[PDB]
Ligand binder design. Sequence first.
Ligand code: CL
Lengths: 320, 320, 320, 320, 319, 319
Amino acid sequence: FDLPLEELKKYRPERYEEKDFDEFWEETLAESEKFPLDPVFERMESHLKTVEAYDVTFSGYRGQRIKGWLLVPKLEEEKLPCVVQYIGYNGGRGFPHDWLFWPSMGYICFVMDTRGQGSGWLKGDTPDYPEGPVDPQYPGFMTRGILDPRTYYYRRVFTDAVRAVEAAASFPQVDQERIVIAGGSQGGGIALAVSALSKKAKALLCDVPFLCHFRRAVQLVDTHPYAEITNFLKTHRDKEEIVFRTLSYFDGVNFAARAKIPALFSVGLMDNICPPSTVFAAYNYYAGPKEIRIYPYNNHEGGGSFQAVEQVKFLKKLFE
Amino acid sequence: FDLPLEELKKYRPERYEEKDFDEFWEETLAESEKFPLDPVFERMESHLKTVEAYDVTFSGYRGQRIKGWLLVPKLEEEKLPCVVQYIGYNGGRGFPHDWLFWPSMGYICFVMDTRGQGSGWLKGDTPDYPEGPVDPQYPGFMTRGILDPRTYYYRRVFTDAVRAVEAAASFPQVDQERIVIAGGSQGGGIALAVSALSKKAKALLCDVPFLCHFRRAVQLVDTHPYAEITNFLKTHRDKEEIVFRTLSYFDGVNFAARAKIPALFSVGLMDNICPPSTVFAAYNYYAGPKEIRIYPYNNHEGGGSFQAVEQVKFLKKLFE
Amino acid sequence: FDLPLEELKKYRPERYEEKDFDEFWEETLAESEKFPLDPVFERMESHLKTVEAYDVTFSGYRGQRIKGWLLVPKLEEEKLPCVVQYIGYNGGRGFPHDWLFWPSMGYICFVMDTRGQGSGWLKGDTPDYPEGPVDPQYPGFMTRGILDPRTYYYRRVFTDAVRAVEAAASFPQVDQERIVIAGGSQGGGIALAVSALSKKAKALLCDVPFLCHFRRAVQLVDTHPYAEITNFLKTHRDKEEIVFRTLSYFDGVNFAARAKIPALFSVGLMDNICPPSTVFAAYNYYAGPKEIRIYPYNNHEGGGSFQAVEQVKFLKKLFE
Amino acid sequence: FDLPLEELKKYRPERYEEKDFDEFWEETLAESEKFPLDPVFERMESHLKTVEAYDVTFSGYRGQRIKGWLLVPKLEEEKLPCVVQYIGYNGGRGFPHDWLFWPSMGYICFVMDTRGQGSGWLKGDTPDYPEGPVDPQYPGFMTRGILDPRTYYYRRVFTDAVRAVEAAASFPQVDQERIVIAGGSQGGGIALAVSALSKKAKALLCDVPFLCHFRRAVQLVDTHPYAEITNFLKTHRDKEEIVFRTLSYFDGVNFAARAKIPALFSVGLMDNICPPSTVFAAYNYYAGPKEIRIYPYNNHEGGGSFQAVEQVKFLKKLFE
Amino acid sequence: FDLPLEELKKYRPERYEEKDFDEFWEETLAESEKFPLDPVFERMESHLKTVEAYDVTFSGYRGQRIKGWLLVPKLEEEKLPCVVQYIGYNGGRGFPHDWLFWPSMGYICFVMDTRGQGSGWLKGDTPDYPGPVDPQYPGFMTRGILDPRTYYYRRVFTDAVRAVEAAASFPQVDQERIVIAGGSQGGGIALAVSALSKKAKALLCDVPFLCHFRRAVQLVDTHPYAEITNFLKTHRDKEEIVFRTLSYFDGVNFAARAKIPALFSVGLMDNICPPSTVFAAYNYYAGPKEIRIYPYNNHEGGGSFQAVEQVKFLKKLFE
Amino acid sequence: FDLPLEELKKYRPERYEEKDFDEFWEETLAESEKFPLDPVFERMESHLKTVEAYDVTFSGYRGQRIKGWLLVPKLEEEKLPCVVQYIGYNGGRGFPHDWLFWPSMGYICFVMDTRGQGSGWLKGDTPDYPGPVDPQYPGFMTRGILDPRTYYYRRVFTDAVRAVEAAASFPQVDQERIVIAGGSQGGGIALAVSALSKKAKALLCDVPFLCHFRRAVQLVDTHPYAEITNFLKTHRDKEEIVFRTLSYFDGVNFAARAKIPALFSVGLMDNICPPSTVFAAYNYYAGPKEIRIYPYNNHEGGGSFQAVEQVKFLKKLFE
Ligand SMILES: [Cl-]
């Protein structure tokens, strides 16, 4: 349904960002750095036997305390590599045993809970906090605070996510040379923002990323969650320029252009949640060394368990 | 799809409420009465010629400044009857010309904007404000703060709605003894809550009401917006009792049992958004003088323009 | 889904019409003009207080008696501007209170009932009369009489609509310098025909118009009502040429080319009932002074209440 | 989805008809008998080799001229049994080769074309003619003239169908002792009316019959074509009694109670077009010697080709 | 939704087939020819009066016994033309009275039952016979797809070639007027037969399935082509193997080889058999040919209108 | 959409089985046990670090070689408890890393691949082996349905009995602490195994499929039960035969025979495995039993919540 693959490979649409994109993010991170990280780990009583699980609490946007899990595989090596895992839309940190893959492959896993979500497919424990008034919005998180980038929901999520990497680095068994940031869909868009904003991330795993090339996305598909934006615009006919102006500060295509760390991307060519031209726009602008795995017959599931193995191989080669 | 009509007419299921229902609402309304109402009626340069439109501002929940419209028909009479109109889900106050029916029929119409909504089918101008943290929730308003009646979104809306009647009553041309409260679906549910809580309303028009008999609604239909609650429960599997206990404080059936003013209801027997058993449970417990118009072949549109005529006729006979 | 906007703005495709288009309409109108118009305005008992309502009857196609409403706002004006309102597919004149907008804005409103429809979303009271046998057709109006323009349903509707403006001009309070023809969807298609054929209309309001560019419409979308045509062709496989020949006499694109009066159009770029390339073919051929309001994120709702405000402003400027 | 089979077999609901049902039909048929039948059989040039095909014209309702086919198998017998075949909704007489079953089984087949349809799945050639004005209606045939039994579409169809049997009987090779009336769905409904009204039919084949038990059909399913009725009622909310009064004169259940000839019925227990309770109401009231083939897993296809073999066996046995 | 008609009429995509396409089919057919055909025509007791019905059995793939019907119109001419009819997906031979058209128009009709199907819209009586039946998506499109030797349509298409030999064995059949016909799956089968059989005299190919698989699975998500897509969604490592297998069964590759006169039909709104897949086959078809294009029809194609076009085409051809 | 919970709890519909149910299964198992089990566990090179992964092969129905995974958590304890895991419809054994839950909780996990499937949501490696494959609707539900001896699930349930024997043969498995587990199709398989094998100590049965077929096909039109209804729509003469065959594979009939402690789960909004079908099996289950009821869940059931319940249930059992 989207551009054919040879056009996708060369798709580099003109980028739109405001003159103060960097300043906005510098100011944001500076203000939140004024609050101590105060990363706290508490070993959980758990039935898990191959992994130690810890409850995590750390300061994200404006000192707000974000939950996480830290999963440490019970192995002989002193320092371990670490994957910081961001969660898809309407998910949350769930139970420790929901996140066994990376530890089973020998990596400490830091799972960041997602402020205010945690109610669609996997439970969460972290609340959101708005700046002040909660403006008229369409149901969901995509239009929460959308009339100003200072009030926009993903400002708070992305800052949480940058601080999560510092929180992971605070665990002494983490090898700070081998901290990976990872996610799919919303998780992928979060990780992409982190890949540009974090000083500590060493590699990026970015699967079927959401939060990319918003203007084209709402023109291309009527699926959720991009359709929250479209539905808002159907009602607020006077706010089109403001909406896209705000979203430009959160668009993965704009972060991709600033990111320098090694990355592995994936894309499903039949994905109508995260359309491939949106994924390719981010991938093609990504400034660091990069590869993409292309799944021509998959929808939003992308490469699934095949991709998981591709990721393990990729990291092993990068870090060897 | 629901109970047959002769069973609907006798459907009076056992009500569930906590022992402190009245105290919860007494304390809520008392706390908000501590801020001055400070009703503002600012004439709006509209192009309307048979109606004068005012931009309304008034203090609702905890002093928070709620928007609205006041439309005054251009008539001889010094004291006119008034309809206070509440709005369907995802709507808001829109334009003054969206609410011409009651003014055209000789009634001043006070349209209350809906905090935080106004983004699905008609725009709105009024923000929400959470108590404190914004808990994990499913997209929308149904599960916003659902873990405690003190934090629940409809606490705020219903309080606004009570205060709206006091605001309308402040308008010098409003006849204090002919103030009607009206709404369809969400609007119906809000009006029902107000019919129990306000002491200033003379009559209720309650069309295809939402926010009624939650426990049963989520068993009967998988439509939105009831499905928000179901979807929250699908994830937060431990929270059934808490969710239903919170919702008991906001259930139209429990307000209906308290309401003493004359009411005209309407119901569509094929409505799968507000299922007939939910509307009938409310109607059957409604403690004031009452009638219901039954539309057996209509879905959620109910009686539409026919029902509007029934309303005008009902109010005319009542006020004689 | 249709042509991108830069292409829609330049889209002026080869028109298809028979050499005898004008003759066909000259003869149609002359033939119906032999019967006296005989417009009848019966003041009605009404609950309405700001408006006087009349039950209308007038002679349309071949003297057949068409129903309407006349809504006159109660203002201190010896003459008032007038909107002649045409109605969407499957609608009818409903109740007087269904048409309050234009009276509220200070316009006498003549609502034309639609022959034979009035059964889908708002009731009507006027029958159709065929031009002899009622040929095999697909359910609906789009294919009724389609094998010959002389028998086609829209020949009668459009005649009626032209005659409606003459009937409005016959009410003494109407300001014949300020007669507007308006409609959305089917309404807009009717209004486009009237804009070419009427000697009385002074401005056109044409929203999301239907009955435009039929040949392209059926190639682009499978929605109703355009799909009635496609479904008829799926069965009458021998009638492609005849069907498109008939429809060319009723196509808004060919009327647009003949229209001289000022117009305000609207279009939704996500409209899949009236595709944007069909609306733009009509608009780009429209030969009078014109403007278009473009709603990029809206579907068939177009600009809704925002567009209603644009219309009032447009007409005040035009007529000032 | 409907009553279980054990209850369907005992399902004999309270009937509803007007006291003048028989008078209405007697007057109807007497008036149309005043026009000469003048059955015209024109032998066609055909590629068919086992069958002789004739183009039929005969006088139906009020002398109106109805098309048909007559298919005569090339056999030694001088007199042959005859099946008069009525056609499903939106179909028409199509081509001679569409109707080969019965002639291949050694039956002359008279295929009656259906006035005004013929545009959905098989073409037709016969126009409808209204009783003057064609009232406001929902698209299709179900609500055409529904406000008065004298104007209702199926008054003209059922009269045509009775006259079709008279026309078939007129062909010299037909054995008037072995005239069968047959149809499925709309065809079955028509054939049921004809089993009560024709003095010439000798056996009925009635598959998955439509036009039965209208009041219950519209409560049970939202499929077309019954939904044409529900949709008209959703708009004409003041016409519920009148609509069902009109429909009582055309209801297969009411004809079944009057029919004397032997019949074979079929029913699909998962048929949501003609729900099983509607079909059983008709079968249970049928007053001639009868049998029903019950297909528990089939939808509206019923028994398909299996039922065709049942019919052949049933007729062989009956005709001795 | 597909290429516009002007483009479809000259759509001639580069073909993909293995070097051994012909050898594969030659070996396949020679191995099945080592088993005797043994056509069996059992005259049936029937309620049909204008035709004589026979219960057919013959040997298709590797001597496996395939069911069918033979319908013989009762006519004074001793040698009659014959149509060998293939059946659409999820159908089977049904009852003899399901197939009255061609006999009513004076043609003997040999109806080939379809191995292992017969359970969606019309019943069938003939089993499939595979060794191991590999992991597959529900249905027939992916059965044995990892090797052309094990692929389901190897067996169907062999059956279908053998069916023409079985029809020709019937003594009233005029061997100079044997037609092969079908729609959708039937048309894809008939298209393979048009290349592989030395006995067919003409081809009726409506709305053909089993054509241009690579494009088909990119263009539509309908069944049955979506069985292949779904298999590929799970077996991510088998993309090249899957399309290599399918190339041996692709109508476009058969059409390039076929020589007999043919009448095609296509629906421009068909989303089961997309018009570009039909036109790729039609444009490569190497025999004298015509196509009836129905711009507004979906997969129903020309329906009863096309049936008339078929009878006329054959009349003119055989006269 | 199904019976209200109060009635589901009381739903004990009359069971239907043939008088030779036990004899059929005795003969089936005895016939397959005449072939050597021959379990092979080949240690693999893997990226996993906390677990040892083995490629498994063993002899299921009639000596047919079935694939599997064996995942061993790297722990001090020498003889570990073991969960034998059966897979959902259209899945297969996938990758070793697809099954980390039980090993991470301290259980060796034996994952049985499902013959012939492995192509819808997770890949598989094991073929089916039928002679003739009768007319069927696409999928596995109607494959060989005209005779219980030829029916697809005769082969799967035998494989699944055999899997337990194969798990028991691995040296690190505590042969006295083996659990059987599955969801949906996996739950139906495990329910059969709870009746047919005496090796297992407990049953984990989530959202079970293959239960109360006669009712299932009347209540829902979803797949995979609809495969049965669709076959019946066409094979109108085979209704009695179809339901006779299915009675030999109905979880309600196996439940009545099972004795081991069981933990069930049900979603009251599940329209794939309707609550009445699940309660009919649960209500007849003869052993010590409990059911976790998820009133707002569809076919996902309890998801990770239910997994926690499972770990607690097994901990209590094995203390
Ligand atoms: Cl013909």
